[PDB]
Amino acid sequence: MEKVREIVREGIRVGNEDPRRIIHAFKVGLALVLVSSFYYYQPFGPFTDYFGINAMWAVMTVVVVFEFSVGATLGKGLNRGVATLVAGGLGIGAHQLARLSGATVEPILLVMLVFVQAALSTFVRFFPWVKTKFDYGILIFILTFALISLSGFRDEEIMDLAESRLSTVVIGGVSCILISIFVCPVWAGQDLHSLLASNFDTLSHFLQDFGDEYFEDYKVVEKRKKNLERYKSVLDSKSDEEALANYAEWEPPHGQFRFRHPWKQYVAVGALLRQCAYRIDALNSYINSDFQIPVDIKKKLETPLRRMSSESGNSMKEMSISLKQMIKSSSSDIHVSNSQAACKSLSTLLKSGILNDVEPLQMISLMTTVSMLIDIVNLTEKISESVHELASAARFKNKM
Amino acid sequence: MEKVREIVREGIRVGNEDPRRIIHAFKVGLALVLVSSFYYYQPFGPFTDYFGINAMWAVMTVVVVFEFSVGATLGKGLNRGVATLVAGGLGIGAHQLARLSGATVEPILLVMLVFVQAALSTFVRFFPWVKTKFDYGILIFILTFALISLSGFRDEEIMDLAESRLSTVVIGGVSCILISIFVCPVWAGQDLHSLLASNFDTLSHFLQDFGDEYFEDYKVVEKRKKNLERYKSVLDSKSDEEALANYAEWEPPHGQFRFRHPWKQYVAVGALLRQCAYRIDALNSYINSDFQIPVDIKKKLETPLRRMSSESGNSMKEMSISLKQMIKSSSSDIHVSNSQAACKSLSTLLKSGILNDVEPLQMISLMTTVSMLIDIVNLTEKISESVHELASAARFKNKM
């Protein structure tokens, strides 16, 4: 009975982290019922249905095409539809050639053509372009050519089979797409947008928490978590952003998201944020070591380091708010100029020769932190310019 | 005609990068010809084939089940095989309750049961445990229960549709696995064990090259290429190493890979190697920056910083050979002990007070690299103890 407890608790947490999952679990059932209902109560023209498997194929298309996002279902349905169309054409042509050839060489020719085409398509499925965008199209191309060839039917029977398969794929796909767009849309573009903004926010949190924690049993573990987990999640999220970018490319335009929305720039800014995460990770690893410098030697540089960290955090926070609000912002300029000024002041403080009296190992550690922080500052400057460019060339509301 | 070139030249570089991609495009063609033979030349017992679509379903399973690796086909073909066996049972029992109830309620009770279980199964597909292993198993559990329900057939006609679907998944599913295993096996287990051992070698190049590029237009770029584009493949390959580990659990025990081969330790080590790529990434930026320290000030630490960097790379080089050769190796202990020795002799060089005379704006970047290098040496000591542990719990030949 205990595993029943564990599975129901896992269900509870998965549902509570996200409700759109439950609403999608209901949307799939609604699509199935709508499609199935369509066949039982023939709406306007009782379709011929020569083979007796139209309903089977409609339900199969609906179960396979319907995915979480809107870009996912639109892409899967469009690949499946276009591949079925072209491959049905090619299959009818191959069957006509097979018939025209002769009597006994017909199975030989059909099997040879299936071989050649499946081989060429399986090879093409390895290209990078195809692998990222139209993969599921080519699996269906092979499926359909092999269906219309290797299934033993006669000529007119083959023409009817191809038409039936195409019409059923179109109906299943359109039903899936309409219910996914019009009931409770999960746009992948907005999921990518929110993920980018959330990443910005976690980085700001760490920068402020560092400015505080650097110069100072259970609460130790909680603060260790509140430091580690956030940037450590930014680090391990390359594939999620890369996938949401494709899905978002597939989508139609909707509110505040115009026709040419640059998702590749979103992924570029994500890459810059990942570099910041590398540096922040080095900083954190130097926080959680045992060999820590005595406090006052850090406090002798406590002023500019605290100023630098705080201003970087505030600049990142303003960029996150400017992305959540979908408006061009110009506070990041002030918040990054302050950090450049703090870098210059730290430079002229180091020039004055204050660290001349400390043992050089403490110098190792202290200049390590100073170097990582200066690199973080330069990186936030670059990120500020890049986000400004994205917001310009994605047509944000110039109101500010 | 020019775009006909950019497609054929892209074909060649995909074929030469990996030849096994072509021998796979011929293995898919061979499973179709073999299956389509089994259903044309009935070997021993002419199957009943009540509906006329056994040959369609056998060729539809082969196109979907057959994937590159062996763990991918043994995995897709085992989800699809079991999900059809169970759902075929639930698909019949759900069709007995429909009849037992009444006449007009029959098309009402069957649609509800498709709704309830396609809504629960869609939800389970979000769980983190299910999503990695048995995902395609649950997409099929929804097709099958919605094949045997939402397709209009009578009572006795269903006990055949459930068997005709199951017996055409076992045959189309086995015929895919016997070819993947016996013709030219692409074991995903070895594609991971090779990638891990190829990563160690990419890092060893940078460390051997570091001591030379540090202390010293086109060869600018190629040597920039042989640094940047080399280690940067370790950072961007978190998903490939994680995918090949999922397959590698499905596979059978081929030669030198016992039954309990720890594919989760292979990813734990790869997780440490990604931490070295973080630090190595920081060393690279201070190499490609404009503000470079004048040489002779760098040169006063050239004795240990060249000994630390080199003996670390000669330690990662043995771990890469101790994995290609699949033998427990104790050479890495000699190569890692020297690096810890070079760390202490750097302290007694730093404690002796030699860097007291350089302007502190330069001590930033100089004590930076000393810090990133000392952390790398500290990491390869942890990697060495982990690979040494992997070789035990994978039962490597103790010959050495």
PDB file of C-alpha atoms in Angstrom, chain A residues 18-187:
ATOM      1  CA  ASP A  18       1.613  23.036 -12.875  1.00  0.00           C
ATOM      2  CA  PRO A  19      -2.157  22.974 -13.525  1.00  0.00           C
ATOM      3  CA  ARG A  20      -1.900  23.327 -17.293  1.00  0.00           C
ATOM      4  CA  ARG A  21      -0.854  19.688 -17.227  1.00  0.00           C
ATOM      5  CA  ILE A  22      -4.268  18.694 -15.896  1.00  0.00           C
ATOM      6  CA  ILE A  23      -6.087  20.958 -18.320  1.00  0.00           C
ATOM      7  CA  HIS A  24      -4.144  19.344 -21.170  1.00  0.00           C
ATOM      8  CA  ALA A  25      -4.920  15.867 -19.877  1.00  0.00           C
ATOM      9  CA  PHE A  26      -8.560  16.848 -20.293  1.00  0.00           C
ATOM     10  CA  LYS A  27      -8.063  18.523 -23.680  1.00  0.00           C
ATOM     11  CA  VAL A  28      -6.778  15.244 -25.123  1.00  0.00           C
ATOM     12  CA  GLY A  29      -9.908  13.403 -24.044  1.00  0.00           C
ATOM     13  CA  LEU A  30     -12.024  16.174 -25.520  1.00  0.00           C
ATOM     14  CA  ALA A  31     -10.275  15.831 -28.875  1.00  0.00           C
ATOM     15  CA  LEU A  32     -10.806  12.070 -28.861  1.00  0.00           C
ATOM     16  CA  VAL A  33     -14.513  12.411 -28.095  1.00  0.00           C
ATOM     17  CA  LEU A  34     -15.034  15.126 -30.697  1.00  0.00           C
ATOM     18  CA  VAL A  35     -13.358  13.098 -33.450  1.00  0.00           C
ATOM     19  CA  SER A  36     -15.065   9.840 -32.529  1.00  0.00           C
ATOM     20  CA  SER A  37     -18.415  11.605 -32.331  1.00  0.00           C
ATOM     21  CA  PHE A  38     -17.883  13.001 -35.833  1.00  0.00           C
ATOM     22  CA  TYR A  39     -17.806   9.536 -37.354  1.00  0.00           C
ATOM     23  CA  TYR A  40     -20.771   8.080 -35.436  1.00  0.00           C
ATOM     24  CA  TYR A  41     -23.081  10.993 -36.266  1.00  0.00           C
ATOM     25  CA  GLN A  42     -22.170  11.695 -39.888  1.00  0.00           C
ATOM     26  CA  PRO A  43     -22.638  15.478 -40.020  1.00  0.00           C
ATOM     27  CA  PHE A  44     -23.439  16.376 -43.597  1.00  0.00           C
ATOM     28  CA  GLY A  45     -22.195  13.762 -46.045  1.00  0.00           C
ATOM     29  CA  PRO A  46     -21.955  10.093 -45.166  1.00  0.00           C
ATOM     30  CA  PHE A  47     -18.415   9.313 -46.269  1.00  0.00           C
ATOM     31  CA  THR A  48     -17.897   6.256 -48.448  1.00  0.00           C
ATOM     32  CA  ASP A  49     -15.428   4.521 -46.086  1.00  0.00           C
ATOM     33  CA  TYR A  50     -14.527   1.680 -48.412  1.00  0.00           C
ATOM     34  CA  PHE A  51     -12.188  -0.225 -46.091  1.00  0.00           C
ATOM     35  CA  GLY A  52     -13.790   0.141 -42.666  1.00  0.00           C
ATOM     36  CA  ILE A  53     -10.886   1.741 -40.805  1.00  0.00           C
ATOM     37  CA  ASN A  54     -11.505   5.471 -41.138  1.00  0.00           C
ATOM     38  CA  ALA A  55     -12.389   5.794 -37.461  1.00  0.00           C
ATOM     39  CA  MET A  56      -9.332   3.787 -36.418  1.00  0.00           C
ATOM     40  CA  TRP A  57      -7.052   6.087 -38.361  1.00  0.00           C
ATOM     41  CA  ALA A  58      -8.707   9.278 -37.121  1.00  0.00           C
ATOM     42  CA  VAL A  59      -8.310   8.250 -33.508  1.00  0.00           C
ATOM     43  CA  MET A  60      -4.721   7.182 -34.132  1.00  0.00           C
ATOM     44  CA  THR A  61      -3.854  10.517 -35.725  1.00  0.00           C
ATOM     45  CA  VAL A  62      -5.432  12.406 -32.836  1.00  0.00           C
ATOM     46  CA  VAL A  63      -3.589  10.392 -30.200  1.00  0.00           C
ATOM     47  CA  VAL A  64      -0.235  10.759 -31.936  1.00  0.00           C
ATOM     48  CA  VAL A  65      -0.421  14.408 -33.044  1.00  0.00           C
ATOM     49  CA  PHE A  66      -1.686  16.046 -29.845  1.00  0.00           C
ATOM     50  CA  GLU A  67       1.225  17.364 -27.751  1.00  0.00           C
ATOM     51  CA  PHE A  68       1.539  19.827 -24.873  1.00  0.00           C
ATOM     52  CA  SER A  69       2.434  23.099 -26.584  1.00  0.00           C
ATOM     53  CA  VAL A  70       0.730  24.631 -29.592  1.00  0.00           C
ATOM     54  CA  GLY A  71       3.894  24.631 -31.650  1.00  0.00           C
ATOM     55  CA  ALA A  72       4.343  20.932 -30.973  1.00  0.00           C
ATOM     56  CA  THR A  73       0.901  19.949 -32.238  1.00  0.00           C
ATOM     57  CA  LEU A  74       1.062  22.338 -35.172  1.00  0.00           C
ATOM     58  CA  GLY A  75       4.437  20.960 -36.223  1.00  0.00           C
ATOM     59  CA  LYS A  76       3.497  17.316 -35.792  1.00  0.00           C
ATOM     60  CA  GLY A  77       0.205  17.745 -37.610  1.00  0.00           C
ATOM     61  CA  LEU A  78       1.766  19.668 -40.461  1.00  0.00           C
ATOM     62  CA  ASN A  79       4.599  17.169 -40.920  1.00  0.00           C
ATOM     63  CA  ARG A  80       2.148  14.268 -40.838  1.00  0.00           C
ATOM     64  CA  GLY A  81      -0.242  15.900 -43.298  1.00  0.00           C
ATOM     65  CA  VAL A  82       2.327  16.972 -45.865  1.00  0.00           C
ATOM     66  CA  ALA A  83       4.222  13.687 -45.665  1.00  0.00           C
ATOM     67  CA  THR A  84       1.027  11.693 -46.110  1.00  0.00           C
ATOM     68  CA  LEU A  85       0.091  13.799 -49.135  1.00  0.00           C
ATOM     69  CA  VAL A  86       3.407  13.525 -50.973  1.00  0.00           C
ATOM     70  CA  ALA A  87       4.010   9.901 -50.026  1.00  0.00           C
ATOM     71  CA  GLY A  88       0.518   8.881 -51.107  1.00  0.00           C
ATOM     72  CA  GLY A  89       1.215  10.441 -54.469  1.00  0.00           C
ATOM     73  CA  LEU A  90       4.502   8.563 -54.738  1.00  0.00           C
ATOM     74  CA  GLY A  91       2.902   5.303 -53.624  1.00  0.00           C
ATOM     75  CA  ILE A  92       0.147   5.490 -56.210  1.00  0.00           C
ATOM     76  CA  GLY A  93       2.807   6.174 -58.828  1.00  0.00           C
ATOM     77  CA  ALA A  94       4.909   3.212 -57.727  1.00  0.00           C
ATOM     78  CA  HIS A  95       1.898   0.920 -57.808  1.00  0.00           C
ATOM     79  CA  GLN A  96       1.021   2.102 -61.311  1.00  0.00           C
ATOM     80  CA  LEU A  97       4.565   1.352 -62.482  1.00  0.00           C
ATOM     81  CA  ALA A  98       4.461  -2.067 -60.841  1.00  0.00           C
ATOM     82  CA  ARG A  99       1.212  -2.898 -62.622  1.00  0.00           C
ATOM     83  CA  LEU A 100       2.445  -1.579 -65.972  1.00  0.00           C
ATOM     84  CA  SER A 101       5.612  -3.689 -65.815  1.00  0.00           C
ATOM     85  CA  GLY A 102       4.297  -7.230 -65.775  1.00  0.00           C
ATOM     86  CA  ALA A 103       2.558 -10.030 -63.928  1.00  0.00           C
ATOM     87  CA  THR A 104       5.028 -11.844 -61.666  1.00  0.00           C
ATOM     88  CA  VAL A 105       7.645  -9.084 -61.357  1.00  0.00           C
ATOM     89  CA  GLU A 106       5.099  -6.864 -59.609  1.00  0.00           C
ATOM     90  CA  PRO A 107       5.944  -7.896 -56.011  1.00  0.00           C
ATOM     91  CA  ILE A 108       9.635  -7.805 -56.933  1.00  0.00           C
ATOM     92  CA  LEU A 109       9.423  -4.236 -58.211  1.00  0.00           C
ATOM     93  CA  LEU A 110       7.318  -3.053 -55.280  1.00  0.00           C
ATOM     94  CA  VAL A 111       9.706  -4.498 -52.715  1.00  0.00           C
ATOM     95  CA  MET A 112      12.708  -3.022 -54.533  1.00  0.00           C
ATOM     96  CA  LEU A 113      11.155   0.444 -54.550  1.00  0.00           C
ATOM     97  CA  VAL A 114      10.256   0.216 -50.865  1.00  0.00           C
ATOM     98  CA  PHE A 115      13.852  -0.766 -50.166  1.00  0.00           C
ATOM     99  CA  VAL A 116      15.420   2.092 -52.121  1.00  0.00           C
ATOM    100  CA  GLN A 117      13.110   4.758 -50.733  1.00  0.00           C
ATOM    101  CA  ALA A 118      13.265   3.625 -47.104  1.00  0.00           C
ATOM    102  CA  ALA A 119      17.056   3.513 -47.336  1.00  0.00           C
ATOM    103  CA  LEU A 120      17.393   7.010 -48.791  1.00  0.00           C
ATOM    104  CA  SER A 121      14.953   8.492 -46.291  1.00  0.00           C
ATOM    105  CA  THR A 122      16.518   6.788 -43.284  1.00  0.00           C
ATOM    106  CA  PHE A 123      19.823   8.266 -44.393  1.00  0.00           C
ATOM    107  CA  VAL A 124      18.399  11.771 -44.848  1.00  0.00           C
ATOM    108  CA  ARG A 125      17.010  11.575 -41.308  1.00  0.00           C
ATOM    109  CA  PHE A 126      20.567  12.109 -40.000  1.00  0.00           C
ATOM    110  CA  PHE A 127      21.143  15.575 -41.454  1.00  0.00           C
ATOM    111  CA  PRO A 128      21.191  18.298 -38.773  1.00  0.00           C
ATOM    112  CA  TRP A 129      18.628  20.592 -40.408  1.00  0.00           C
ATOM    113  CA  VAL A 130      16.168  17.743 -40.917  1.00  0.00           C
ATOM    114  CA  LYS A 131      16.955  16.304 -37.498  1.00  0.00           C
ATOM    115  CA  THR A 132      15.923  19.496 -35.730  1.00  0.00           C
ATOM    116  CA  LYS A 133      12.898  20.533 -37.762  1.00  0.00           C
ATOM    117  CA  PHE A 134      11.247  17.916 -39.994  1.00  0.00           C
ATOM    118  CA  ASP A 135      12.223  14.627 -38.364  1.00  0.00           C
ATOM    119  CA  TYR A 136       8.722  13.297 -37.754  1.00  0.00           C
ATOM    120  CA  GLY A 137       7.866  14.153 -41.340  1.00  0.00           C
ATOM    121  CA  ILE A 138      10.259  11.586 -42.751  1.00  0.00           C
ATOM    122  CA  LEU A 139       9.247   8.784 -40.418  1.00  0.00           C
ATOM    123  CA  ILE A 140       5.740   9.311 -41.766  1.00  0.00           C
ATOM    124  CA  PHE A 141       7.012   9.474 -45.345  1.00  0.00           C
ATOM    125  CA  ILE A 142       8.502   6.002 -44.928  1.00  0.00           C
ATOM    126  CA  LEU A 143       5.401   4.742 -43.098  1.00  0.00           C
ATOM    127  CA  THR A 144       3.078   5.884 -45.854  1.00  0.00           C
ATOM    128  CA  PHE A 145       5.099   4.694 -48.822  1.00  0.00           C
ATOM    129  CA  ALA A 146       5.459   1.297 -47.168  1.00  0.00           C
ATOM    130  CA  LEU A 147       1.735   1.270 -46.353  1.00  0.00           C
ATOM    131  CA  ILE A 148       0.524   1.972 -49.856  1.00  0.00           C
ATOM    132  CA  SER A 149       3.110  -0.354 -51.405  1.00  0.00           C
ATOM    133  CA  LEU A 150       3.590  -3.391 -49.182  1.00  0.00           C
ATOM    134  CA  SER A 151      -0.132  -3.825 -48.490  1.00  0.00           C
ATOM    135  CA  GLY A 152      -1.633  -6.113 -51.080  1.00  0.00           C
ATOM    136  CA  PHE A 153      -4.417  -4.267 -52.885  1.00  0.00           C
ATOM    137  CA  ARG A 154      -5.498  -3.649 -56.463  1.00  0.00           C
ATOM    138  CA  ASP A 155      -5.214  -0.452 -58.496  1.00  0.00           C
ATOM    139  CA  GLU A 156      -8.472   1.400 -57.788  1.00  0.00           C
ATOM    140  CA  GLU A 157      -8.265  -0.041 -54.288  1.00  0.00           C
ATOM    141  CA  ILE A 158      -4.883   1.665 -53.907  1.00  0.00           C
ATOM    142  CA  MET A 159      -6.206   5.011 -55.126  1.00  0.00           C
ATOM    143  CA  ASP A 160      -9.062   4.740 -52.633  1.00  0.00           C
ATOM    144  CA  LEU A 161      -6.697   3.719 -49.835  1.00  0.00           C
ATOM    145  CA  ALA A 162      -4.469   6.728 -50.442  1.00  0.00           C
ATOM    146  CA  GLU A 163      -7.406   9.130 -50.489  1.00  0.00           C
ATOM    147  CA  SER A 164      -8.840   7.588 -47.324  1.00  0.00           C
ATOM    148  CA  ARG A 165      -5.563   7.808 -45.418  1.00  0.00           C
ATOM    149  CA  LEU A 166      -5.017  11.413 -46.470  1.00  0.00           C
ATOM    150  CA  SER A 167      -8.523  12.550 -45.543  1.00  0.00           C
ATOM    151  CA  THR A 168      -8.370  10.840 -42.180  1.00  0.00           C
ATOM    152  CA  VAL A 169      -4.979  12.365 -41.357  1.00  0.00           C
ATOM    153  CA  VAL A 170      -6.268  15.817 -42.276  1.00  0.00           C
ATOM    154  CA  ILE A 171      -9.372  15.490 -40.116  1.00  0.00           C
ATOM    155  CA  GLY A 172      -7.526  14.156 -37.084  1.00  0.00           C
ATOM    156  CA  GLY A 173      -4.864  16.832 -37.392  1.00  0.00           C
ATOM    157  CA  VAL A 174      -7.269  19.735 -37.779  1.00  0.00           C
ATOM    158  CA  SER A 175      -9.320  18.567 -34.814  1.00  0.00           C
ATOM    159  CA  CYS A 176      -6.222  18.342 -32.630  1.00  0.00           C
ATOM    160  CA  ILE A 177      -4.979  21.762 -33.706  1.00  0.00           C
ATOM    161  CA  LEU A 178      -8.287  23.552 -33.214  1.00  0.00           C
ATOM    162  CA  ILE A 179      -8.814  22.165 -29.737  1.00  0.00           C
ATOM    163  CA  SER A 180      -5.224  22.939 -28.793  1.00  0.00           C
ATOM    164  CA  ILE A 181      -5.413  26.552 -29.964  1.00  0.00           C
ATOM    165  CA  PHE A 182      -8.909  27.526 -28.869  1.00  0.00           C
ATOM    166  CA  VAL A 183      -9.544  25.877 -25.504  1.00  0.00           C
ATOM    167  CA  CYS A 184      -6.613  26.744 -23.228  1.00  0.00           C
ATOM    168  CA  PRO A 185      -3.608  27.503 -25.381  1.00  0.00           C
ATOM    169  CA  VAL A 186      -0.187  26.586 -24.100  1.00  0.00           C
ATOM    170  CA  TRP A 187       2.011  28.698 -26.334  1.00  0.00           C
TER     171      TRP A 187
END
